[PDB]
Chains A and B, each alone.
Chain A
Amino acid sequence: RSPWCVICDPSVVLALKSLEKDYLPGHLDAKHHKAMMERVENAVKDFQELAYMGVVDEATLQKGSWSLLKDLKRITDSDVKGDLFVKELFWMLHLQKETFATYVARFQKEAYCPNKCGVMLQTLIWCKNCKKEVHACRKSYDCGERNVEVPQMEDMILDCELNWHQASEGLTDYSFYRVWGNNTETLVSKGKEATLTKPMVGPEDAGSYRCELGSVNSSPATIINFHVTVLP
């Protein structure tokens, strides 16, 4: 037993209050109001159409809610009353739920934790209590090696950016290290630059490099290792 996530939207809940207070007096017997609304509130507090994780993003919530409110207004503007009204309404809610189920399923397959490696932090809304918090999407410790060969005397670009970094929350700085054969390291840059440029490369610039994208949290969000070869 879980709610239809759409009540997490304030405009939706207010539209439902407005339906009860503004629309029902003029369009339905007073006797029927309380039962009607208990009936509506049941339709909304249970969502049977859905592996559902109980979460949604703001976009998905908005899409559903917009759809719902748009159709709901269609009904109220039509000025329909009695049986007609009751049955149209619940029939609408049913179909809306099926539509929303789709938005959810799409969200789970395409927008929930899209990173393919590392750790992405993303804000979700928990449907069971409308609470909105940041979730960690952990896919893998590493983001893998990059093998790079550079013509001598040309510029070396090491790219630490991934598809999803723009979207992730809680990211700080891209730190770049040189990794020496003697088991030590040196920090060479640290900033909002997702790349490292070393210009006009010489043989001495070959070897191991590492990127770490920092997080507001205690550990890095992306780690990428580069192995650099210089063509003499």
Chain B
Amino acid sequence: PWGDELLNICMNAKHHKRVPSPEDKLYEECIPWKDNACCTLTTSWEAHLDVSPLYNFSLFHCGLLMPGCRKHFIQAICFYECSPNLGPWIQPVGERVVNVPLCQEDCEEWWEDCRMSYTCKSNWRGGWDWSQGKNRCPKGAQCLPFSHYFPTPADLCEKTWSNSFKASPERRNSGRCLQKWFEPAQGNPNVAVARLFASEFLE
């Protein structure tokens, strides 16, 4: 009836904690998940590194991102790595996550703040020149503003992370979409969203 099997769990990917539990300390942008996290301190710290050892994927491939843009990408990582409220969207590839609905604000602000930064492809899931150990832009792929390769917020949310996320038309506090970041003061707005979807009442 309610999908409690699917609540308060962590996906089986190589970095993730097997089970969620509180942490004394998490680095910067992953602080909102202190209460109950699927990331260790080390994971949280690693999320903020240039060419994070978590993925060996370079964001600076078209040069260094504006800090505001970088912040969004890091938060995405914090969320992916730390959230105990993704059960309903977990699927096998040894697991991943598919079409987690990010609230419209999250995708819009992310898009907004990355407009000035630069990239070379619109589908980051593959098709990279991988020769150095880390991805670089393939021959003939021009570095241009994000708004060129990601004309909409939806493009950005969905294609950078290989359909791990879906751009929901629902707005924050609807009860029907998740925030990739939230102020620790405010309490976690995604717990109830997870519950709802776990239930037989929503798919």
Q: Which residues from chain A sit less than 8 Å from chain B, CB to CB? A: 1-2, 52-55, 124, 126, 128-129, 131, 133-136, 138, 141, 217-219
Contacts and interface: CB of A to CB of B under 8 A. Distances in A.
B116 A53 contact: no
Interface in B101-153: 116, 118, 142-143
Given A136-B48, A138-B49, A141-B45, A218 B31 contact: yes
Query: By CB atoms of chain A within 10 A, which of B28, B48, B116 has the most?
Result: B28
Given A135-B67, A141-B41, 16 more contacts: A1-B142, A52-B63, A54-B64, A54-B118, A55-B64, A126-B66, A129-B116, A131-B66, A136-B67, A138-B48, A138-B50, A141-B45, A218-B28, A218-B29, A219-B27, A219-B28
A62 to B, nearest CB: 20
A53 B67 contact: no
Contacts of A141: 27, 41-42, 45
Contacts of B142: 1
B27 A128 contact: no
Contact of B67 (A52, A54, A134): A134
Nearest to A124: B64
B57 interface: no
28 contacts: A1-B142, A2-B143, A53-B60, A53-B63, A53-B64, A54-B62, A54-B63, A54-B64, A55-B63, A55-B64, A124-B64, A126-B63, A126-B64, A126-B66, A128-B118, A129-B116, A131-B116, A133-B67, A133-B68, A135-B64, A135-B67, A141-B27, A141-B42, A141-B45, A217-B28, A218-B28, A218-B29, A219-B28
B60 A133 contact: no
Contacts of A135: 64, 67
Nearest to B46: A141
A10 to B, nearest CB: 20
A138 B31 CA distance: 17
A133 B66 contact: yes
Interface in B145-185: none
A192 B63 CA distance: 36
Nearest to B62: A54
Contacts of A55: 63-64
Nearest to B71: A136
Nearest to A126: B66
